Symmetry: D3
Amino acid sequence: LKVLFIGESWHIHMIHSKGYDSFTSSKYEEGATWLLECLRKGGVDIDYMPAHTVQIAFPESIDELNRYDVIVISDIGSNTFLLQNETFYQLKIKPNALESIKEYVKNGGGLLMIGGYLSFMGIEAKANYKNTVLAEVLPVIMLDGDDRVEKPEGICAEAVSPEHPVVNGFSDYPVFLGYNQAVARDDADVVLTINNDPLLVFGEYQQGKTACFMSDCSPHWGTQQFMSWPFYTDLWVNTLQFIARK
Amino acid sequence: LKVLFIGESWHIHMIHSKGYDSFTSSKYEEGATWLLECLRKGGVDIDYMPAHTVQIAFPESIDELNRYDVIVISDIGSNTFLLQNETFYQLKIKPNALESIKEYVKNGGGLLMIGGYLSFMGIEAKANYKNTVLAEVLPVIMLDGDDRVEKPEGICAEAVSPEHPVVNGFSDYPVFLGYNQAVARDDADVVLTINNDPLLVFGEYQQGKTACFMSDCSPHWGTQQFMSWPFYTDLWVNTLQFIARK
Amino acid sequence: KKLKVLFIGESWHIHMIHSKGYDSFTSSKYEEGATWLLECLRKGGVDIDYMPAHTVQIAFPESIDELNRYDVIVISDIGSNTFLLQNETFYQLKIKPNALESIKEYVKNGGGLLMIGGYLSFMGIEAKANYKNTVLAEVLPVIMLDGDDRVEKPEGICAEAVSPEHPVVNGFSDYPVFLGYNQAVARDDADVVLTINNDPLLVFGEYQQGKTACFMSDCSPHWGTQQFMSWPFYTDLWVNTLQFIARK
Amino acid sequence: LKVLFIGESWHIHMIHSKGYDSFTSSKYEEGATWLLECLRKGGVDIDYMPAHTVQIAFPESIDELNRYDVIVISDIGSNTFLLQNETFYQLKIKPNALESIKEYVKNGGGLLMIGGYLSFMGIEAKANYKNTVLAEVLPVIMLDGDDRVEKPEGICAEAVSPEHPVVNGFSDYPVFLGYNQAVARDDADVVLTINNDPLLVFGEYQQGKTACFMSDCSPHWGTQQFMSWPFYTDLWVNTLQFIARK
Amino acid sequence: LKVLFIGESWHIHMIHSKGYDSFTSSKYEEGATWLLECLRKGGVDIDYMPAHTVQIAFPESIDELNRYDVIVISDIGSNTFLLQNETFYQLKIKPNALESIKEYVKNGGGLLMIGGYLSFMGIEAKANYKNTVLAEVLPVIMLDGDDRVEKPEGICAEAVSPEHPVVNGFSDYPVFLGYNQAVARDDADVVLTINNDPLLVFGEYQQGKTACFMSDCSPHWGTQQFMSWPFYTDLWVNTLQFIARK
Amino acid sequence: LKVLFIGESWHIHMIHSKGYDSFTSSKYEEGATWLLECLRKGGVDIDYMPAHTVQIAFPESIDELNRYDVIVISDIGSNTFLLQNETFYQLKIKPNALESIKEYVKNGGGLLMIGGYLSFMGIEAKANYKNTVLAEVLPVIMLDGDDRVEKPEGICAEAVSPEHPVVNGFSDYPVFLGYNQAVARDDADVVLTINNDPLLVFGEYQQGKTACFMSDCSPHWGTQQFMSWPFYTDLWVNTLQFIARK
């Protein structure tokens, strides 16, 4: 099982202001710690690609993407795919990464999007996925502005399709502190809900298969109850297996 | 009258660029110093909670809140309540501040929202109140995006209910330089208008009474003329009095 | 025939924070974005006043009589906030005439208005240009989207003439590629002359005595390609459209 | 014992860049809350002043300052004192706070400076105390530039006068992760050292007693070992008592 | 009298953090609008070159600079001259603007430098002129770091050579709120001092004449008193006339 | 030949202000991709550690560094080595990276420092190496502040020891757009000069060998002329060999 995992990286610039003055500290992080560990011990072969790597060296032809059984996109916005460094600074004409991913799915590849501030529409609608060529590929329809539902008190998932292969045999469903609100396309399969909204949704796109998980795999939307839940590793392994190219 | 007044505080970081170079200066400031003085001189006992205080120490129990007759919210966005520091950084599960306020009004508490860049939807829709559980509490319906109406040339408030107890006897209404555009709910009372949009609106949410002032109590939208208006204190005192716990 | 045009916008001030591990140094960079275009209009006989964004903040004309001297006003890559929230308004507590009202009255009374697309035009990036929620929306011959209205095409797509006999574009050929545009809907009132990805690209209208135009992509990179800049009809396009909508 | 404790507060300013895009996060924090609570529980009456308050509301009269037995300055640079908002933005003439403090010590009051990134010279020499009218008041002589000594390995303190009233009885000296490098003046008593540099130093300036602790009372220089060290509270209580106006 | 006036412009990026959220406003200002009016009213022919214009369009050859009798440098650091856009971003090799200026003074041109945060050494020594090829042209010797003397209390200027043609028949000198501290030079003439440091200094460099005014022509160091002083226009016109190309 | 190459990486966050408004674009870049490729093709086996990796994963063990024949430090400041994430954010005691590097060289390892804004002292003295435990290892003595010499007009390298093994045979020396200014130690060998200042210096520290190259390997200081100079690879390959363990 060959998986391309894109995103879950950030560069924080901190300005510490003390009265009149300030000094800065800068940091690089990667965010999918418990998830990529769970996937690796679960038999998945991950090629990890940080957001900044998309900007410099996203594959220019579909053949390179074709080796992957699933592509995962998490906490990385459409602007990163569409406005690669060569496009935005170097005045080049470049192949469209999102059309590439679209073609990839058309011809058999799986696609998962995991929720977050830079997934779907996201914080201040920055992820902007709705207004891109990738919107039609996805089994949910996005809202037109900021789509976050913030639940700092926590709220739990429900199985609505408990007999579905991905979640059959699961129970005692965990709690989340937020998600992106979207509306499942009506030909899609909703498997888990949250707060009267979809949480886990499967669809199809020509030959390929699609999944959306509307919450996060890590903090803060993903809680301790979530990552310690007996069925955490199986959720992500099972969803990738379900949508993998055959 | 005991009143909790939340917001009207900011930390400015200024980056001054002179050609190639830049130096910084930083500045904390409070915005409704005049208003709070007028309210205290009109006999109101005010507990002032600046925005950073919400982040560190917002009351977790409705019992703490129930000792207030009115809570006022001005220039502080929904994210500040929902994403407190223990939530966003320390990975804690925290009671929901907006639910707490919602519960407080439910049980006889009065709620005022004052307009500004960080009220209602606000600049770039950053206040984002429409997409929250507090939306249902307010006597107005907000727009889906940035809801500012900028009027640098100034427009007058107009009284469409000159007889309303809160505004009775006022005259010579002042000029404002902008407001948040919203739609008064069907069951709410429009007392004042601005550019024919609602300006002062009153309503109910179970046992509690609600109010929205659609422009600012402070500059630049709340003008010098507004702040030194004879009815300025009356306006604000009368409205707290009107929606106070009975 | 002899055009006096006010060209507003097409300037910016980048602050760059260069983070190297723990540390950062900064460099700050002014640029102007339409030097090429302005040179072409100069050579094509247009009398141009250039007003960068910062100059609208300090010194936008308060008098309509002062605007009335211009045959056309061009707005490009400058947001509505810049016009509405001049320094005296936002910092200095003054009442001040509304720049967008002034522009509106200038059009009502026979002035021309051209808006050129970009990140700080129409709605633009993150909807910051925000023109739909301003008193200028009714003046334009297009209806904007409710959010971010960019269509990014890194692979490029070419413009197409849907009214190739229209005076402005008559005789043009070999239309160039663009890397993006602002998506809008033409008023069913207006004349769509060029399209891009089947969306309007060049649109003409009227507003009381004045005449209006919208070009939905950029005059400059990255949306305006080098191919577009050196396209044989670049000059005539902008010159003809200025001339089409000019006062008289 | 009546003490004016200045500083140990900051606002960050977090820019989170995920590929092309970024979103921001902001928080105010206070660094010495438990220390301050420990001082109050140990009989010290504290007026606490976050750095931003210094810019808004610093005492202009000598008589106001004279009511304090000690003033403490921690992680707030000279610019904050010299460039209050009325000076830097409001273009008003106003009393010099550093002259006020210097005058306060002449008249008998105690002064302690705790090290950190915005004490002494500090990071990029931004604190800049050496170039101010307060330099002559301090019992140490500062470097010409950035005076940090970073010790991420840790280094333990050392008593050179273990018999001094302030540190008599103390034992098991904890580690620090750094300090500001300076030189004790000839007329000054060095009580603790750090990597052979002064760590704790007492002196006099006319009637007033003075003190410098060269590391931080807080993270990260003040280690967890230091926070929890028996005598940690005693160090602070003792040095305050020692330098206090009687 | 033909004069090139460089600097006195900045672009400010303001980050207004209201709790979790922040909004931004950017602001361009020119700082010597008043000075330039006074100078042109004194019949000086001024070409004004903002800092950003130096970045983008500084004259490449000395011929163009020689149309000026004096060059004035105010609140623009040496990095702006040394690191123009083509140099720093476009990989081009180009003429050294600081060398050009120095050559200009060498062959008759006059040079005045006016103090500020981006003059001489300046705030955090960012202006950095001491470490440049221009330092030897100036009739003062700078300090090795931050050279600001901050005087929010105010200090008046004092004439030590009232007989000098520049200040003849000036009296009642205004207050200033700070200045850059420098020394000497031995063969230079100090006309005004400030807090016993030089304020207005004249010297020469080969054929050209030089001047340094150590404080600001503008706020906040240059107070509104100074701005409204009857000899404000006379000071600047006389200094310019005194150093103009003979 | 086994070489650890550290630095030459940065994340840019760009704030584009157009009038009142701004949008942001961010990008990670690497600056020595060319050099690294040249060195690979020239028989050097490189482990490349970008700055952010030093913050997360710097060899705690002196035995880890001992596997390397040379360590190269370029455009990365002392602070990054000293203030790794677990030091600065988590509150953990860590081995001192600079002490490790010193021990490493002391025991026979090679050390090359390449010039730029975040080397030696650098821009605003930010690299700060002079005030660290690594300073005594380097074969040069650094200035006390900003040590840049900007030469936008270009300046040639010169050979002063043409017969030195590192440069023997080189000719037609390229032009540089700047360098850090330092002074060679008496016991060290100066092989190349720039503007009469040292450009290439070799030394020893106990068993180990040291090199310093005072200009940049990359733009803008390192011109296109330098980078495509026939001896470009030989310069770096030769210097690595000359200082290699041993």
